[PDB]
């Protein structure tokens, strides 16, 4: 866990000695920071670091923790370089989406001290809406975050190669194992087969690049952390109009609309309409998210950690190949007001032909008073949407 520098023979720049031992999320967080400090004191110019790893391993939350510790750094999200015309699919896992011509030009300009126009990608329209002007930051540290941030095209230009593995990405594999394990099976062999089925590109395209990392971080998923800081939800049957919400709420509440489609999956086996731990596949604005449905009911609140990570549609096929079955499909249209801390929204679900008001946020006191500000007392429904259709059979 001691960061040490060694001159790379291909140039005069120094490099981090590889740390073969995998490192914790907290320990790796400090190892990366101290490595950048030593690299900045011994090499001139841009300090470019590639943060690679699968979706859900925790590379996104890793970047935003470094940003909060050091606002002087800049984060470049490699998915903003996507070009949808290159593939006929819509899988974000695809390594053929990235426009390496724009990416390599941007980093070469930043190395020469020039500001560059880094693209901005909208997944809803699957197109490049525009560009943003990125200058070399004060700390001259730039983090390139993406699944293939350690690709062969980028490794020569990277100063530090960091990989993140595990997280909810691996926890799903263990969750599937809990659901489908049979007696006499060697658990590690099944885990390997689950990963091949549910993550059909990890072993081939993603993992080999991760092995070249100099700081290997293994984020162990904590089941108890989600309930420490969960999401508190109040659902109402009242008819609070979006016009009423706009006036009642502060001008800090941004207004937006969206359409979502949720696929509820049941584990294989015989759950007699009870003991049912659903897996939810959510489609929203060109992205698929897999959600764990772990709910508690403190009337009138319904509480859940809302653990989710981005997945491909291929994951749905893999889960069904492993015995998971589709219980129902819920299509809704929503009008959302977001304080960036508290969300007030109205959802219309086709299957119920009903409109409900939802106030959600991580601060329980904020959620309750905002619902009280809208006069929602006496109209609360302390049930999940999937539970409501079950109740209304």
- For residue 17, what are its two tokens? 């000695």
Distances (CA, A) of 168 to 114, 292, 311: 38, 10, 11
**Which among 165, 4, 152, 136 has a CA at the least distance from the CA of 73?**
136
Distance CA 158, CA 225 (A): 33
- CA count, 13 A, side-chain hemisphere, 108: 7
Residue 243 neighbours by CB distance under 10 Å: 8
How far apart CA 189 and CA 180 sit, in angstroms, is 13
SS (H, E, C) the chain: CCCCEEECCCCCCEEECCEEEEECHHHHHHHHHHHHHHHHHHCCCCEEEEEECCCCCCHHHHHHHHHHHCCCCEEEEHHHHECHHHCCCCCCCCCCCECHHHHHHHHHHHHCCCCEEEEEEECCCCEEEEEEEECCCCCCEEEEECCCCCCCCCHHHCCEEEEEEEHHHHHHHHHHHHHHCCCCCCHHHHHHHHHHHHCCCHHHHHHHHHCCCCEEEEECCCHHHHHHCCEEEEEECCCCCHHHHHHHCCCCCEEEEEEEEEEEEECCCCCCCCCCCCEEEEEECCCEEEEECCCEEECCEEEECCCEEEECHHHHHHHHHCCCEEEEEEEEEEEEEECCCEEEEEEEECCCCEEEEEEEECCHHHHHHHHHHCCCCCCECCCCHHHHHHHCC
Torsion of CA 315, 281, 226, 368, to 10 degrees: 170
State the first-to-last Cα distance of the chain, in angstroms, to the nearest integer. 58
Angle formed by the axes of helices 313-321 and 187-198, nearest 10°: 140
Q: Is 29 left (phi over 0), alpha (psi -120 to 50) or beta?
A: alpha
Q: How far apart are CA 238 and CA 299, in angstroms?
A: 17
Query: 58 in the Ramachandran plot: left (φ > 0), alpha (ψ -120 to 50) or beta?
Result: left
Asked whether 257 and 336 are in contact (CB, 8 A), the reply is: yes
Residue 52 CA to its chain's centroid (Å): 13
Contact 259, 334 (CB under 8 A): yes
Alpha carbons 272 and 362: distance in angstroms, whole number:
33
Residue labelled with tokens 């249209």 = 333
The string over 217-227, giving b where at least 16 C-beta atoms fall within 10 Å of a residue's C-beta and e elsewhere, is: bbbebeeeebe
Distances (CA, A) of 184 to 172, 188, 268: 22, 12, 18
CA distances from 250 to 253, 254, 339 (A): 6, 9, 8
Q: Are 389 and 351 in contact (CB under 8 A)?
A: yes
CA distance 289 to 310: 4
Which residues, including other chains, have CB under 8 Å from residue 365's CB and lie 6 or more apart? none
Query: What sign has the CA pseudo-torsion 333, 338, 340, 343?
Result: negative
Cβ 232 vs Cβ 295: under 8 Å: no
Question: What order of strands is seen across the sheet that includes strand 325-338?
Answer: 296-298, 301-304, 231-236, 354-361, 342-349, 325-338, 254-266, 279-284, 288-292, 308-311
Beta strands at 231-236 and 254-266: parallel, antiparallel or unpaired: unpaired
Instruction: Enter the resolution in angstroms.
Output: 2.7
- Record the tokens describing residue 33, joined without a space: 């920071």
Between CA 292 and CA 300 the distance in angstroms is 22
Cβ pair 184, 237 in contact under 8 A: no
Contact indicator for 231, 304 with CB cutoff of 8 Å:
yes
CA angle 305, 307, 312 (to 5 degrees): 160
- Separation in Å, CA 369 to CA 76, 363, 365, 374: 38, 10, 6, 9
Interacting residues of 3 by C-beta distance below 8 A, sequence separation 6+: 16, 17, 19, 31, 34, 35, 38
- Would you tell me how many other CB atoms lie within 10 Å of the CB of residue 244? 14
Method for structure elucidation? X-ray
Exposed, middle or buried by CB within 10 Å (0-12, 13-18, 19+), for 35? buried
| HSE-CB of 247 using CA atoms within 13 angstroms | 4
């Amino acid at each position: 866990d001691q960061v040490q520098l060694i001159k790379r023979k291909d140039s005069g720049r120094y490099e981090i000695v590889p740390i073969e031992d995998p490192l914790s999320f907290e320990k790796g967080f400090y190892a990366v920071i101290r490595a950048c400090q030593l690299l900045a004191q011994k090499n001139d110019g841009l300090i470019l670091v590639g943060l690679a790893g699968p979706s859900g391993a925790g590379k996104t939350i890793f970047t935003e923790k470094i940003l909060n510790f050091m606002p002087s750094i800049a984060i470049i999200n490699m998915d903003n370089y996507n070009d949808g015309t290159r593939v006929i699919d819509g899988n974000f896992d695809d390594p053929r989406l990235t426009d390496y011509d724009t990416l390599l030009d941007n980093i070469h300009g930043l190395r020469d001290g020039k500001p560059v126009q880094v693209p901005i990608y909208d997944f809803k329209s699957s197109s490049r809406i525009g560009y943003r002007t990125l200058e070399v930051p004060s700390s001259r540290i730039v983090i390139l975050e993406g699944i293939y941030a350690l690709s062969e095209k980028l490794r020569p230009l990277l100063d530090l190669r960091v990989s993140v593995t595990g997280g909810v990405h691996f926890d799903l594999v263990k969750r599937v194992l809990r659901d489908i394990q049979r007696a006499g099976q060697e658990p590690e062999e099944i885990i390997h087969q689950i990963s091949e089925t549910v993550y059909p590109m990890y072993k081939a395209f993603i993992e080999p690049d991760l092995k070249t990392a100099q700081i290997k971080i293994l984020n162990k998923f904590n089941p108890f952390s989600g309930f420490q800081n969960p999401t508190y939800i109040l659902k109402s049957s009242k008819a609070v109009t979006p016009e009423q919400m706009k006036a009642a709420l502060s001008e800090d509440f941004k207004e937006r609309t969206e359409e979502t489609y949720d696929i509820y999956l049941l584990p294989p086996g015989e759950d007699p309409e009870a003991c049912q731990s659903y897996l939810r596949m959510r489609n929203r604005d060109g992205k698929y998210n897999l959600m764990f449905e772990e709910w508690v009911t403190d009337r009138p609140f319904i509480i859940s950690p809302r653990i989710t990570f981005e997945v491909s549609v291929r994951l749905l096929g893999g889960l069904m190949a492993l015995g998971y079955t589709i219980a129902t499909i819920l299509k809704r249209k929503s009008h959302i007001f977001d304080d960036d801390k508290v969300i007030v929204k109205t959802d219309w679900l086709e299957q119920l032909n009903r409109t409900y008001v939802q106030v959600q946020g991580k601060d329980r006191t904020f959620v309750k008073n905002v619902a009280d500000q809208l006069g929602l007392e006496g109209s609360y429904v302390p049930h999940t949407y999937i539970e409501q259709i079950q109740l209304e059979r």
